[PDB]
Write a protein that binds this ligand. Sequence first.
Ligand SMILES: COc1cc(-c2cncc(-c3ccc(C4CCN(C)CC4)cc3)c2C)cc(OC)c1OC
Ligand SMILES: COc1cc(-c2cncc(-c3ccc(C4CCN(C)CC4)cc3)c2C)cc(OC)c1OC
Ligand SMILES: COc1cc(-c2cncc(-c3ccc(C4CCN(C)CC4)cc3)c2C)cc(OC)c1OC
Ligand SMILES: COc1cc(-c2cncc(-c3ccc(C4CCN(C)CC4)cc3)c2C)cc(OC)c1OC
Lengths: 293, 285
Amino acid sequence: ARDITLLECVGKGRYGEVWRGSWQGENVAVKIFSSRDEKSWFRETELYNTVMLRHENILGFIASDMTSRHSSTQLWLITHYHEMGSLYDYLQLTTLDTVSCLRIVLSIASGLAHLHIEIFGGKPAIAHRDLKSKNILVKKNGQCCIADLGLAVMHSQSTNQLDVGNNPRVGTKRYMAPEVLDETIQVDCFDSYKRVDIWAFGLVLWEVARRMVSNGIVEDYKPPFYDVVPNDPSFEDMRKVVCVDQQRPNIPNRWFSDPTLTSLAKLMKECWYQNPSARLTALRIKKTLTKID
Amino acid sequence: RTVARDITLLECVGKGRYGEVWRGSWQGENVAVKIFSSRDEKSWFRETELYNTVMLRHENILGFIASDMTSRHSSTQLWLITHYHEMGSLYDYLQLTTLDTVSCLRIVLSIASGLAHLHIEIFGGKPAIAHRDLKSKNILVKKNGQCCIADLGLAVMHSQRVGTKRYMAPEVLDETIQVDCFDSYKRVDIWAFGLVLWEVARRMVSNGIVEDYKPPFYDVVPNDPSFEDMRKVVCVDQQRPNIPNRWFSDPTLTSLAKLMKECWYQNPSARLTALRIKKTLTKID
Ligand SMILES: COc1cc(-c2cncc(-c3ccc(C4CCN(C)CC4)cc3)c2C)cc(OC)c1OC
Ligand SMILES: COc1cc(-c2cncc(-c3ccc(C4CCN(C)CC4)cc3)c2C)cc(OC)c1OC
Ligand SMILES: COc1cc(-c2cncc(-c3ccc(C4CCN(C)CC4)cc3)c2C)cc(OC)c1OC
Ligand SMILES: COc1cc(-c2cncc(-c3ccc(C4CCN(C)CC4)cc3)c2C)cc(OC)c1OC
């Protein structure tokens, strides 16, 4: 029972398109890649070949296909479907209580620690390189899963092998770490890519915490750096604010009246050091969030 | 819209260390489905990366349809789907069939055509490609009498010891191959082409005479030769396949003997190019 029916488009952009489809009488998500992003399709396919990748907080794949007749090629990725959409979509619409806020951020930390930590026997260590709220899906149990492994990079400690792949694509400009924006990142060092993920995770923590109510107050949804860069920021716009101006997202002062938001502000600042080796690990973030409340 | 992905697997036409090849049916049409073993996973990734880079389309290259990866409970299933050629491999065909002058030339010119197409860089186009496992089992026979080259699971691309041991060039066996020079890999293919040309020419009738099908070096190495077995024959003793006297009574086989010796020089840079083999073959008969 391999057939799929495409039912409605739930996303269109430079990446291609995502469809809600029907397969074996279940909803599936079907991504059809743009020609411009063919190397992302292949990288994501290499990543999903890892059976031990599977995790409650990683988007589950069903199949990957490259199809062709004559001169045209289609590139397909079929995954589980999350009708609540991305965390970006969800935060526009909804405020959070303490329980819901911690459940979301701990689930992302759990997914990211699962990616970063090598499993021996297995799964290589994996750095994502494009973590952001559009690449996180919300599940009906109030946990999230991380999506889009097209830029990922794999490392095996046992065999001393680093696979950075071949993909000219770069991460989403708004979420790029200082060392990415100033292009000084150590490209032959696996730990460099984990540290880029931690920066981006800090930004996602900020986006989420803004939406958690405390003392009758909440902030409106805003993307990171909304106050300091143009609407559709360029690479150089982001380099200006992050590297030249040393800007970091502002902590609303109302957070300091709430113990949970005070803990989260501390945690996001430890993701944002210009010095990448100073930043927390995904495991330490997971352990910290496990303890918070 | 409905995306019909069901393929009916009808009969197994190949089983090996690589996995299995099945004749299958998609929407009424024969396809060939290669199901990869864990042993041979990297061949699916390499061929898939190549076709993701350049969608080869040539009458003498096995026609790509799809690369499929399906998640299972405890494994990943990897399928390559191509055109189906019911006559099977050249290896199979030659066991079962003698050739006349026209069929022999049509087979070898079609192989040279496929191989030159792989080897050529085309600008605007395709990268240059070396096959790295050319042999009679990796060539399929079409109903029109032409062949197509199959299995790009070891192929290497360029823009400006993985092969079958019996078909390895001397520079592969003695580890002198200039691994930094893409032309090295083209020259390894040409050596193998020359062995295939010998396998085919043996089955061409002249003056009521034909040789039995044998694989290259059948008379000097064991049924399943070691790397060392091949090195001693090809590198140390510098043996080459036997050219039977009866060929020198036939103008076509005399010309094909000359061509196969210009594929078997010890010095890789002395060997003919695929394009020069094509031109030579179009002037025979
Ligand atoms: C994978 O292989 C096979 C696929 C198909 C197949 C099925 N539906 C649609 C298509 C198709 C339609 C249209 C376009 C283009 C046309 C021009 N452009 C402006 C827009 C899009 C591309 C593709 C195909 C090719 C048929 C096959 O056999 C008949 C295949 O071979 C087994
Ligand atoms: C990020 O990356 C991938 C995501 C998905 C995916 C999986 N479930 C659900 C979705 C979704 C559904 C619906 C909406 C709503 C949002 C608000 N509303 C106004 C419009 C529609 C949003 C999102 C998606 C996009 C699949 C992918 O591959 C198949 C992804 O690529 C790896
Ligand atoms: C995913 O998997 C398999 C798919 C197929 C297959 C079946 N029907 C139709 C198609 C098709 C082709 C092309 C378009 C175009 C339409 C125009 N526009 C520019 C976007 C895209 C749409 C649909 C395909 C590709 C066959 C398979 O096996 C033979 C598949 O499994 C390997
Ligand atoms: C070398 O490589 C690949 C080859 C093929 C492939 C393509 N058409 C047809 C075939 C085939 C059909 C039928 C017979 C036999 C049946 C019994 N009878 C007594 C003689 C004939 C043999 C062979 C194959 C094996 C597909 C592949 O991948 C999908 C290959 O791998 C790239």
